[PDB]
Design a protein around this ligand. Structure first.
Ligand SMILES: CCCCCCCCCCCCC/C=C/[C@H](O)[C@H](N)CO
Ligand SMILES: CCCCCCCCCCCCC/C=C/[C@H](O)[C@H](N)CO
Lengths: 245, 297, 193, 245, 297
């Protein structure tokens, strides 16, 4: 926890100083969460720690020709990312999160982003003629990687849903003009009390640059984007298979 | 003996408070002064104001009751049930005397929403829902003339077998509820309970006795032609043989006790298929009627 | 506190200055390494130049560890994040930034930091040197410290490109020196009249 | 714990019933243990559970031509055995143990064994002419496996120490005549406060059949020997290496 | 927020008790009856008996003091120090006027136990020990005749360099303690503290500034000829040149403040090497003097 464990670096590309930018709404870790109920002969347990620290996946770069990127959960919690030592064994999973997005730029750049979390974000793929009613949902697209993937048509959100009405979900406006911080908290969202470690992927994270990035020649042409997450209140259990030892 | 323990994740202080019941608003606020009121005094124009408060004839006095309109109508036609008010014609089952559509009298149909794109549009504003259901049945000849005849209706719960021929014992059964009524009688009003195996309607692995969900290895989401085994319907013509009149049956579905969760942006593309919201990725269209310029209308 | 040389590449006379500080210019800015070193005070390399190593060169039970400090000299408008990680003894240095992110680490920044003070823990498990005779055992190892480019070095159009990070060195009140032994050096010239 | 977790079988080759045989001396898990001190810039931590259950390694068979077998610690705690998921990463280790040995035979067999734990049991190898003062200690002998290894000359203990005076260390007499149980408890024994995950192997377990096994023809010619252990109060920590992520 | 926690490993009840100081034994027990005393009554012969108790002239009365022997000698020559009583001749350094053994006056020696197999046998009954040390030095000619000459002794702590030639500045140094005395003077009694880097004597990785222990990859346990750098000794002949008499120096080591731990069975095979207790695996011998038969002596 704190800011150290294995990863102790606290200085990104601009090597910034002078305190941090968080802007807290809640009161410093507002309590634990529930356990719910079930209707079968299964029951999970808790792994406590080693998942309670912070994590900083790779930094994607913003350019003028950018279109936006998205992530799927808990795809990045698996081996597809830093973790993967306690994610592919068990069967049940559920957790909150403390997602923090930190950007950085000089005072001469312009542009503005938009963060949003869409629960049960099922992509309708690129489509456009790929006639599929129900044959085989893809796995090479819905799980790109911990790096995310650039969008094709952000206006229709590559699914047919308009981008304009996105702000219904929780969202913040990353504006290069004034601030660079973005802290969001997402509780557990699922119909069933507990989820599986399989193709029942939870909410997806969306980041779309609405205001295009621009500047004058001679300055830095690319602005990095940092992604951090903190799995509040996670669990792991459930396993039964062939020959055991 | 024990050396390791750590959970934390807690906060202490002003969690909850006193327990009261005072569902009545009172005069709140008044006024506060700032500075010299001017138009172009230098910092910002178009300054603000404030009020105190009042709530109809309940709060404060009740000396005069001057509403905006002298009680024209009701003011709550906006709830979820109000939205889901009508009962649209969902099923249009057709029974000819002879032909290829339904030659053997039997006709199988199942509940769905993709039959009406408008209904699907209206129903897909959310993610999770929980509602009851009702059904009404009207039978008439293509020329609209009642005839003397008896009909057999039956509901089929999820996972039950499919009666294919008129001679199928599934028509007999004992577990599948059935309804018998002559068509000259009034229509057959009926209700259907909440038949989902979870707390909200959501597809994927919910049908078939076998497996499901994404990335199949152990199951097919086909089940032959009746994909996604769920609440379906069946209908015969009562008789050891064929009937003497053509029939055109109709369905009327109606929600009741509707509760939604997790709204999402509605839609901005034409629907393509069932259970797979694709779109015209090469024929992407705008949303509103575009105008010529921005300076002028 | 005493400044510590890490970029100890030059060996000439005029270029003696930049042994102390190292560049953080913006050419590559995603996943490469800046510099690494050991934590051995009185053997060779960095700590040999500070005062802590100089005092370690008079005993046998040393640590050569604990807190350090990095002071940035970016102009005023430089932003960027550095990754600092420490590897415990008996371990290999990570081959990527993700592996180094695990364990213990800290993410620096240039917005308003201008300073950072990482601390090294102290652990003693194995046998330093149990030589009944010399020339039979050559088994020595120690943990390492690395610096990684987290993000590229942002700069507005008008400011310089290359900056310089300096490094400090100190300890605290936990560890002690022991076993007073006579120091051996070459700081002589023979002709001392 | 209890008797179940993953391994739930509680019936060996004879498929015995009618309660268990333990013969307890102490009072039901007599408290926790200490943490000691150190003299450096290192400090360990605890893994709590997932090592608190029981473990039953493979069963070795007793025959007339048997000579005896031995084990090394914590060699069987590593991947050389059932465990190996939290043993090769960290650096420090220390634990007590609850070792239980259960044999089984009819009323017509004869013979008697001997269990003993020898701290810092450094083998002197087979020797006999292999002139080695200090060149290269072997690794193919001192770490045979979780199966143990049959002794060469038990009278001199394959090291030159007489077998007669073995009973100085804690020991029990496995006698086929009356009982079949053997419960022993071994606390942490090491000069340094904490041990490494390397060639600083702790005590070794010895089992030597003094009274030879014998019977009459027609009965079962081989008697199995079960080995169980329980790592009371274990710890794991310490790691630093090359490029990290 | 936190959902998992489990340590246990504890027991409650009769842990400790009252605090007293009563180091004096009192009459304990008396008698109890069982059955009819007979020889072959049927179950078991050779029955038992019991007593009450008494402890010298302290416990109970002190009317008569009739010990077994009228105070012959002391009765405690069995402690650890008593065991480690004498001071054996460990070092026998020899200095000729000319020759090949020690031509250049210098002579290097180090502490060890394998020089005396009997001493090693006596000292290897345990695993862990902690003791101080002392040394005494006697110098004489091979014919045993004192001569006028001065000698230089010095102790070398572990990890210090090895003075090879008489001209080596390590002879000068400042950190290595040195002792100067003429040989006509009485011997040089001296003490050496506990120089181990742990709480007990145990080899493996303890020497060399570099690594060690088993399975070398980064270190050699050679250090040239002086393997296992540890507390060694050095001795010269004082003078810018050679000396005029042959010398035969001797050492006398003596433990003091001895504490052992973890006894082990002593030994039943001949020693072979240093730091590697091998044995004659093909020439294994018995232990006691075997006799002919068992029925007779
Ligand atoms: C398999 C068909 C849907 C594939 C996934 C696309 C969106 C996933 C969430 C919506 C689909 C299931 C949740 C319920 C939606 C509608 O309200 C139901 N059809 C109610 O009848
Ligand atoms: C490297 C030499 C020993 C190799 C291991 C064989 C036995 C290990 C334990 C005994 C050796 C170290 C412990 C101390 C034994 C003797 O008491 C010391 N030499 C005391 O002088």
């Amino acid at each position: 926890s704190d800011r150290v464990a294995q990863l102790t670096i606290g200085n990104s590309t601009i090597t910034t100083q002078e305190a941090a930018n968080i802007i807290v709404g809640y009161g410093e870790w507002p309590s634990y969460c529930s356990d719910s109920d079930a209707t079968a002969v299964d029951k999970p347990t808790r792994p406590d720690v080693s998942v309670n620290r912070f994590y900083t996946l790779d930094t994607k770069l913003w350019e003028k020709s950018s279109k936006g990127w998205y992530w799927k959960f808990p795809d990045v919690l698996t081996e597809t990312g830093v973790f993967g030592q306690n994610a592919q064994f068990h069967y049940l999973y559920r957790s909150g999160f403390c997602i923090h997005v930190q950007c950085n730029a000089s005072k001469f750049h312009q542009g503005a982003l938009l963060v949003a979390v869409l629960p049960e974000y099922v992509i309708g793929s690129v489509a456009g003629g790929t006639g599929t009613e129900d044959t085989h949902p893809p796995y090479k697209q819905t799980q790109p990687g911990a790096d995310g993937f650039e969008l094709q048509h952000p206006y229709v959100l590559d699914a047919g849903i308009p981008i304009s009405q996105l702000t219904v979900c929780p969202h913040q406006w990353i504006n290069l003009r004034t601030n660079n911080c973005a802290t969001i908290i997402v509780p557990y969202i699922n119909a069933l009390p507990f989820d599986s470690a399989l193709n029942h992927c939870n909410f997806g994270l969306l980041v779309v640059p609405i205001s295009p990035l621009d500047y004058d020649q001679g300055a830095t042409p690319v602005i990095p984007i940092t992604i951090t997450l903190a799995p509040m209140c996670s669990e792991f259990a459930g396993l039964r298979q062939a020959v055991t030892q | 003996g024990d050396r390791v323990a750590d959970v934390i994740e807690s906060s202490i202080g002003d969690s909850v408070s006193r327990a009261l019941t005072r569902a009545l608003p009172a005069p709140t606020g008044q006024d506060t002064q700032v500075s010299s009121h001017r138009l172009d005094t230098g910092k910002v124009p178009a300054l603000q104001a404030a009020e105190i408060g009042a709530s109809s004839n309940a709060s404060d006095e009740s000396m005069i009751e001057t509403r905006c309109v002298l009680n024209s109508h009701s003011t709550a036609e906006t709830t979820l049930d109000s939205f889901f008010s009508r009962a649209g014609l969902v099923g249009e089952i057709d029974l000819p005397l002879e032909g290829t559509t339904n030659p053997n009298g039997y006709a199988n149909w199942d509940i769905d929403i993709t039959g009406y794109a408008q209904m699907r549009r209206k129903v897909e504003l959310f993610t999770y829902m929980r509602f009851d259901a009702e059904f009404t049945f009207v039978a008439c000849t293509p020329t609209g003339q009642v005839v003397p005849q008896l009909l057999q209706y039956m509901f089929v719960p999820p996972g039950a077998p499919e009666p294919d021929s008129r001679e199928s014992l599934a028509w007999q059964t004992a577990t599948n509820p059935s309804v018998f009524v002559k068509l000259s009688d009034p229509p057959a009003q009926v209700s259907v309970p909440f038949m989902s195996p979870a707390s909200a309607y959501q597809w994927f692995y919910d049908g078939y006795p076998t497996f499901g969900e994404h990335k199949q290895e152990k199951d097919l989401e086909y089940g032959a032609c009746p994909n996604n085994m769920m609440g379906t319907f069946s209908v015969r013509t009562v008789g050891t043989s064929k009937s003497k009149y053509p029939l055109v049956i109709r369905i009327y579905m109606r929600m009741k006790h509707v509760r939604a969760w997790i709204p999402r942006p509605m839609r901005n593309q034409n629907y393509l298929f069932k259970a797979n919201p694709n779109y015209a990725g090469n024929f992407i269209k705008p949303t509103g009627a575009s105008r010529t310029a921005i300076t002028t209308l | 506190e005493t400044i510590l040389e890490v970029n100890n590449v030059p060996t000439n006379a005029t270029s003696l200055m930049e042994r102390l500080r190292f560049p953080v210019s913006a050419q590559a800015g995603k996943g490469e390494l800046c510099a690494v070193f050991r934590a051995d005070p009185g053997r060779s390399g960095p700590w040999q130049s500070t005062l802590l190593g100089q005092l370690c060169g008079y005993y046998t039970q040393w640590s050569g560890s604990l807190e350090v400090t990095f002071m940035f000299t970016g102009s005023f408008m430089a932003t960027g994040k550095m990754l600092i990680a420490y590897t415990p003894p008996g371990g290999p240095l990570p081959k990527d930034r993700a592996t180094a992110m695990l364990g213990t680490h800290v993410i620096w920044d240039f917005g308003l930091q201008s300073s950072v003070t990482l601390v090294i823990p102290w652990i003693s498990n194995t046998h330093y040197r149990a030589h009944a005779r010399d020339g039979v055992f050559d088994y020595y190892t120690t943990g390492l410290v690395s610096i990684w480019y987290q993000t590229n070095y942002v700069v507005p159009i008008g400011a310089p490109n290359t900056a310089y990070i300096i490094a400090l060195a100190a300890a605290q009140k936990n560890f002690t020196m022991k076993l007073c032994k006579d120091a051996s050096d070459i700081l002589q010239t023979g002709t001392i009249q």
